[PDB]
């Protein structure tokens, strides 16, 4: 029989391993051109303490018109302070995060963090403009927001011993 602790022990080594790798990759740069940062993967793992939830939300899907809460995630990787907005996938992922971020300055390790860069269609309808209510679209900066899916795991370190392990293993 395999013990359930082996799940907690696999994510122990999975979090710390992916932390070292991606931490270095984020210091180096997120995808230098066509995949050439350091270790180019879709999902990363890092550590930071909870800042705040922004009062505003982000429209993540136009078809089904859903907006997701902003969990402000800034941390100093090496020299640079990477300040990007942590997002949730579903309503269940949003609610578990807001119920988890009850403690401010909560130092946790966000595992399996899937980065999403903003974009849209670009050629224009030029037709069926009867649906329009007179509203010309404003200029939005296409930023990358760090999405948290249902495969993600946010591990809270109540102490600073796992933080100690990670920062001394990575080094800057």
């Amino acid at each position: 029989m395999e013990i359930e602790e082996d799940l907690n022990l696999k994510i122990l080594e999975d979090v710390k391993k992916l932390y070292l790798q991606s931490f270095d990759y984020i210091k180096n740069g997120i995808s230098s051109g066509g995949s050439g940062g350091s270790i180019d993967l879709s999902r990363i793992t890092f550590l930071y303490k909870f800042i705040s939830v922004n009062p505003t939300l982000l429209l993540i899907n136009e078809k089904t018109q859903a907006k997701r809460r902003i969990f402000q995630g800034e941390y100093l990787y090496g020299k640079k302070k990477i300040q990007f907005n942590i997002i949730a996938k579903n309503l269940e992922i949003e609610r578990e995060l807001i119920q988890f971020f009850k403690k401010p300055y909560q130092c946790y390790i966000m595992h399996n963090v899937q980065v999403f860069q903003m974009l849209n269609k670009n050629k224009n309808n030029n037709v069926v403009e009867f649906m329009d209510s007179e509203d010309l679209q404003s200029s939005v900066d296409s930023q990358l927001y760090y999405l948290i899916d249902e495969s993600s795991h946010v591990l809270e370190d109540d102490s600073m011993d796992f933080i100690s392990t990670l920062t001394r293993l990575s080094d800057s």
């Binding site: 899907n61 996938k89 980065v115 999403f116 999405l147």
Partner: peptide
Amino acid sequence: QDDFGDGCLLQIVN
């Protein structure tokens, strides 16, 4: 369909 699926305002870096 899906929040981050086809018809999203954001696509995964890959």
